[PDB]
């Protein structure tokens, strides 16, 4: 549900869209994630491992 | 995530793309306010060949008809 359950009722949302909005929250638009999804996922998996 | 009109992608300027059961609108993230998808509310970026989950739809041009 992202951060939407921290204010009222939890609202479902796909994870890629939530990640895109988090990226947009720091000044980088959505197309970066929407074209580098695989690379970002691989980097996140490597870091968490 | 995006709209593929004619060999191009179309991402929302601000808001999410929604559809009730037949037509696509773009709306805010805190209040249901559907709007007609035109070139003013979307910005083109890409080629529509790498995005996953893109539907086609038909965008609207507010200048050519007039
Ligand atoms: C990513 O998730 C997958 C599950 O979908 C993990 O796959 C298995 O995980 C177990 C537990 O560590 C391993 O023993 C298996 O060898 C994994 N199999 C495969 C085919 O990957 C995977 O480990 C997860 N990746 C990381 C880095 O945790
Ligand atoms: C969905 O929205 C369109 C927008 O024109 C409307 O015509 C239609 O009645 C709505 N409902 C359904 C079930 O399509
Ligand atoms: C969008 O249109 C193209 C050609 O007009 C077609 O090849 C493609 O399959 C369409 N998209 C979907 C999701 O059907």
- Furthest CA-CA distance within chain B: 35
Q: C-alpha angle with apex A23: B9 to B55, nearest 5 degrees?
A: 25
Residues of chain B whose beta carbon is less than 8 angstroms from a beta carbon of chain A are 1-2, 9, 11, 16, 29, 45-46, 50-53
A48: distance to nearest CA of chain B, Å?
24
Per the entry, the structure determination technique was cryo-EM
Residue A26 is classified by DSSP as T
Breaks in chain A, after residue numbers (C to N greater than 2.5 Å):
none
CB contact, 8 Å: A30 with chain B?
Answer: yes
How far is B59 from B61, CA to CA, in rounded Å? 7
Q: What is the DSSP string of chain B?
A: --B-SSSS--EESSSEEEESSS-EEEE-SSS----B-BSSSEE--S-SSS-SS-B----B-SSS--
């Amino acid at each position: 549900s992202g951060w939407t359950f921290g204010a009222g009722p939890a609202l479902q949302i796909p994870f890629p869209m939530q990640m895109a909005y988090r990226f947009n929250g720091i000044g980088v638009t959505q197309n970066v994630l929407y074209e580098n999804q695989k690379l970002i996922a691989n980097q996140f998996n490597s870091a968490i491992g | 995530p995006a709209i593929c009109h004619d060999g191009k992608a179309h991402f929302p300027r601000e808001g999410v793309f929604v559809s009730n059961g037949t037509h696509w609108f773009v709306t805010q993230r805190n209040f249901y306010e559907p709007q007609i998808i035109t070139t003013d509310n979307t910005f083109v970026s890409g080629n529509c060949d790498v995005v996953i989950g893109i539907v086609n739809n038909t965008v609207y041009d507010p200048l050519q008809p007039e």
